[PDB]
């Protein structure tokens, strides 16, 4: 399974990626996760990315493409992979085609989790994640068994810096501008498939398993 997840900030991509990885054993590759880990470590790329992420802007194309090229060339990607929130621009998608031609690992399907913008502010301001393993919760929609504690590793939950009302409105504007050109790129390829993201979390995952059932595991 060679897969991409696309969708607006807060649509449910991370939530569904956790369930796909647990079921099928393929590597989870999230560019947002990679940039936040680098920022916490204080590396030159992490400090560059921080200026863009704090505002709600996208990180420039070529440095982003470069970290993806290197990750996908690893041995653990031989029998499949899941890209979560990359690509984000048509220039990223064009580069990704050339990378996969070269290593012989072409995309099976692009999964678009479709959610309208009027519900996304409430999704993002109540999001809480695990400091140690990244597991995703929501104080109203999907709370942990014990308050402030991860169900998976027992670590402390926290609110991301970028999940504030002012930075969320900027993220929605920036990412919406890229949606129609990216969706048109993959529709013309023939392997874009749509999922209704405005359902219960377990029903969204059911529809995702139904999409993926024709692939070898």
Ligand X SMILES: Nc1ncnc2c1ncn2[C@@H]1O[C@H](COP(=O)(O)OP(=O)(O)OP(=O)(O)OP(=O)(O)OP(=O)(O)OC[C@H]2O[C@@H](n3cnc4c(N)ncnc43)[C@H](O)[C@@H]2O)[C@@H](O)[C@H]1O
CB 83 within 8 A of CB 108: no
Q: 130: part of which helix (H) or strand (E)?
A: strand 127-130
186 in contact with ligand X (CB under 6 A): no
Bridging pattern class, strands 192-196 and 136-138: unpaired
Bridge partner residues of 138 (DSSP):
127, 142
**Binding pattern for the stretch 126-165 against ligand X, x by CB under 6 A and - elsewhere:** -x--------xxx--xx-----------------------
Residue closest to 62 by CA, chosen among 15, 96, 113: 96
87 in contact with Mg ion (CB under 5 A): no
Which position among 3, 4, 9, 192 is part of the footprint of ligand X (CB under 6 A)?
A: 9
Task: Identify the burial level of 62 via C-beta atoms within 10 angstroms of its C-beta, where 0-12 means exposed, 13-18 middle and 19 or more buried.
Answer: exposed
Helix (H, G, I), strand (E, B) or coil at 84: strand
Answer positive or negative: Cα dihedral of 120, 116, 187, 20: positive
217 is catalytic: no
Active-site entry in 88, 105, 128, 152 = 88
CB 8 within 8 A of CB 112: no
**Binding pattern for the stretch 29-68 against Mg ion, x by CB under 5 A and - elsewhere:** ---x------------------------------------
85 is in an annotated binding site: yes
**Binding pattern for the stretch 27-66 against ligand X, x by CB under 6 A and - elsewhere:** ----xx--x----------------xx--xxxx----x--
**Residue 52 binds which entry of Zn ion, Mg ion, ligand X, none, with Cβ cut-offs from 5 to 8 Å by kind?**
ligand X
Number of H helices, E strands in the chain: 8, 8
131 is catalytic: no
Q: Read off the DSSP letter of residue 117.
A: G
150 in contact with Zn ion (CB under 5 A): yes
CA angle 98, 32, 55 (to 5 degrees): 115
CB of 136 to Zn ion, least distance (A): 10
- Point out which residues bind Zn ion (CB under 5 A): 130, 132-133, 135, 150, 152-153, 155
Residues that bind ligand X (CB under 6 A): 7, 9-15, 31-32, 35, 52-53, 56-59, 64, 85-86, 88, 92, 123, 127, 136-138, 141-142, 171, 199, 201, 204
- Known catalytic residues are 13, 88, 127, 160, 171
């Amino acid at each position: 399974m060679n897969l991409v997840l696309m969708g607006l900030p807060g649509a449910g991509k991370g939530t569904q990626a956790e369930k796909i990885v647990e079921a099928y054993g393929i590597p989870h590759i999230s560019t947002g996760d990679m940039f936040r880990a680098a920022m916490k470590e204080g590396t030159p790329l992490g400090l560059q990315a921080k200026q863009y992420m704090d505002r709600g802007d996208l990180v420039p194309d070529e440095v982003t493409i470069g970290i993806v090229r290197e990750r996908l060339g690893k041995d653990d990607c031989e029998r499949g992979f899941l890209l979560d929130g990359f690509p984000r621009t048509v220039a990223q998608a064009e580069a990704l085609e050339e990378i996969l031609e070269d290593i012989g690992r072409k995309i099976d399907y692009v999964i678009h989790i479709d959610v309208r913008q009027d519900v996304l502010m409430e999704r993002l301001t109540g999001r809480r994640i695990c400091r140690n393993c990244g597991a995703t919760y929501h104080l109203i929609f999907h709370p942990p068994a014990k308050p402030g504690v991860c169900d998976k590793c027992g670590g402390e939950l926290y609110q991301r810096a970028d999940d504030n009302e002012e930075t969320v409105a900027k993220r929605l504007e920036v990412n919406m501008k890229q949606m129609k050109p990216l969706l048109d790129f993959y529709e013309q390829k023939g392997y874009l498939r749509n999922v209704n993201g405005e359902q219960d979390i377990e029903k969204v995952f059911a529809d995702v398993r139904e999409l993926l059932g024709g692939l070898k595991r």
